[PDB]
C-alpha cells in the first residue's frame, strides 16, 4: 500500500491543555479524497470526532463540537486536529482515515495513543456472539431512519486487539478491496447486516457497523465480539 | 520523538520465493545507529532475525542463515530484508527497530504482517505471572554462560496485544529513557529478574527477556504473561 496517514503528535496532553495532533498522507491528494479522524479510548468502541472533505467542508461529532477544530494544509498534505479543555474522558488511540468517493473508508493510519493526565447517536450491536469453524455467522445493526434507515451510507469494520480498523463493507452490501466474500452485507428497514460464512479462526475480532445520519454526521455502533469456537 | 521506523513492502509471497521488506528511518543515519530485524508469528515469541550496524557489517540467526541477506542503501535512509525459500512457517509480524550505543534497541517500528501462502540457543521463563495494584511481582529468565552469563547485554521488552515491543531495562540493569522506575532488572549467575514493583493496570501485558550471545546472536526469552487482578 502506497496510500497511507500517519497521525502524530505529544500524547500526554494536561487537563484544560489543548490536545493537537497532524495526520500527514501520501500517495493520494486532500484535494481528491476527505480526511476524518476517529477515536477509541482504552477499553471503548469507535467514536467518531469529525472529518473533512476536498472542498475544506468540515464536519464534528456534535457531542465534541464545543472544543473541535479541524483544518488542513494542502501544501504540505496535511490535516490537523485540535481538541480543546481535554480531559481524563478523552484519553484515547486518535486514528486518521481516508474516505473516498467509490471505495469508503478504505485506508486508516495505525492510531496514535494519547494520555490526559496531570500529576502523574445510537446504533446497537449484540455485545458478543460465537460460531464454529466453517459455519456462517450474523451481526446486526439497530439504529433509526436518520441513519441505518436514511438509505445506503452503512459501513461494517473489523478490529483485531490494537489495531486499525479494517473496512468491509461500504454502501450497506458493497465489499471493499481485497475483502473476501465471505463478508456479505445486507439492510431490511432500521437494521443492517454482516454476514460471515466459512468462519476462519483469523476472523475472531471485534465488529463495528457505522452509518451517516441525516444531520451530515457519522454514527458508530457499539461493537460485536466474535468468538470462533474450533476443536484444538 | 523525531525518531521513527517504518516496515514496508508485498502483501502476501507465494512458498519457496522471495519475502522482501524495506525499513525506511527517519530522525537518525543508519551510519549512526544500528538496525535490526524482529519477527513473531501468530501467537508466538519474539524471534531474533538479523542486524546491520553502522559500517554495514551483519549478523544473522543461525536458524534462518541459510536463506537471509540484509543490505543497506545510506543514502535513501534504508534497510532491507530478503528472505529467500519461504514457506508458512515465515508468517509473521516483521518489527525494524534501532541499535544503539547508550540506549539500548529503544525505538522500533509498528509491525508489518506478512504471510506465506498459495491457494490453499534458549531462554527460559514462566509462562504467567500475577498480581493485584500495588504489590510487586517478579519475572526470572534462565539461560547460560553464553548469554545471560556471557555479561551485562541482557534486555527486557514489554508487548502489549498487537504492538511493537517497547524496551524497558537494557545492560541487565540500566533502566530506559521515558520508563518509569516502578521497573527494575537485575542479575545473579545465568538468571535475570524484571521486578516491577506497585503494580498497575497497564502493565497487564507480555514481557520478553533478550539476551546477547557468544556468537554474536540475540536470543529471545518465551515470554511472560502477566496478568493484575481488579475488584471489577
Known amino acids: 500500500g502506497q496510500v497511507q496517514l500517519q497521525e502524530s503528535g505529544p500524547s500526554l496532553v494536561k487537563p484544560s491543555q489543548t490536545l493537537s495532533l497532524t495526520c500527514t498522507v501520501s500517495g493520494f491528494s486532500i484535494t481528491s479524497d476527505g480526511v476524518l479522524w476517529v477515536r477509541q479510548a482504552p477499553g471503548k468502541a469507535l467514536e467518531w470526532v469529525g472529518a473533512?472533505?476536498?472542498?475544506?467542508?468540515?464536519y464534528y461529532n456534535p457531542a465534541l463540537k464545543s472544543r473541535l477544530s479541524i483544518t488542513r494544509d494542502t501544501s504540505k498534505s496535511q490535516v490537523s486536529l485540535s481538541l480543546s479543555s481535554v480531559t481524563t474522558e478523552d484519553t484515547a488511540v486518535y486514528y486518521c482515515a481516508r474516505d473516498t468517493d467509490y471505495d469508503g473508508m478504505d485506508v486508516w493510519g495505525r492510531g496514535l495513543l494519547v494520555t490526559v493526565s496531570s500529576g502523574g447517536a445510537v446504533l446497537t450491536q449484540p455485545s458478543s456472539v460465537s460460531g464454529s469453524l466453517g459455519q456462517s455467522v450474523s451481526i446486526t445493526c439497530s439504529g433509526s431512519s436518520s441513519n441505518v434507515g436514511y438509505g445506503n451510507y452503512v459501513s461494517w469494520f473489523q478490529q483485531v486487539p490494537g489495531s486499525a480498523p479494517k473496512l468491509l463493507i461500504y454502501g450497506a452490501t458493497s465489499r471493499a478491496s481485497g475483502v473476501p466474500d465471505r463478508f456479505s452485507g445486507s439492510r431490511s428497514g432500521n437494521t443492517a447486516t454482516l454476514t460471515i460464512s466459512s468462519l476462519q479462526a483469523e476472523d475472531e475480532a471485534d465488529y463495528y457497523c457505522?452509518?451517516?445520519?441525516?444531520?451530515?454526521?457519522?454514527?458508530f455502533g457499539s461493537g460485536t465480539r466474535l468468538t470462533v469456537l474450533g476443536l484444538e | 520523538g523525531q525518531v521513527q521506523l517504518q516496515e514496508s513492502g508485498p502483501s502476501l509471497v507465494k512458498p519457496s520465493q522471495t519475502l522482501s521488506l524495506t525499513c525506511t528511518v527517519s530522525g537518525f543515519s543508519i551510519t549512526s545507529d544500528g538496525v535490526l530485524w524482529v519477527r513473531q508469528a501468530p501467537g508466538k515469541a519474539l524471534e531474533w532475525?538479523?542486524?546491520?550496524?553502522?559500517?554495514?557489517?551483519?549478523?544473522?540467526?543461525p536458524a534462518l542463515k541459510s536463506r537471509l541477506s540484509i543490505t543497506r542503501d545510506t543514502s535513501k535512509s534504508q534497510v532491507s530484508l530478503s528472505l529467500s525459500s519461504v514457506t508458512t512457517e515465515d508468517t509473521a509480524v516483521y518489527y525494524c527497530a534501532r541499535d544503539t550505543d547508550y540506549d539500548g534497541m529503544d525505538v522500533w517500528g509498528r509491525g508489518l504482517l506478512v504471510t506465506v501462502s498459495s491457494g490453499g540457543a534458549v531462554l527460559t521463563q514462566p509462562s504467567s505471572v500475577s498480581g493485584s495494584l500495588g504489590q510487586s511481582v517478579s519475572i526470572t529468565c534462565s539461560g547460560s554462560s553464553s548469554n545471560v552469563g556471557y555479561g551485562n547485554y541482557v534486555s527486557w521488552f514489554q508487548q502489549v496485544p498487537g504492538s511493537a515491543p517497547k524496551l524497558l531495562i537494557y545492560g541487565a540493569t540500566s533502566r530506559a529513557s521515558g520508563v518509569p522506575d516502578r521497573f527494575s532488572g537485575s542479575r545473579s549467575g545465568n538468571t535475570a529478574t524484571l521486578t516491577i514493583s506497585s503494580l498497575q493496570a497497564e502493565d497487564e501485558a507480555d514481557?520478553?527477556?533478550?539476551?546477547?550471545?557468544?556468537?554474536?546472536?540475540?536470543?529471545?526469552?518465551?515470554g511472560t504473561r502477566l496478568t493484575v487482578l481488579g475488584l471489577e
Open positions: 457505522a452509518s451517516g445520519d441525516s444531520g451530515s454526521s457519522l454514527v
Open positions: 473533512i472533505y476536498q472542498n475544506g467542508a468540515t
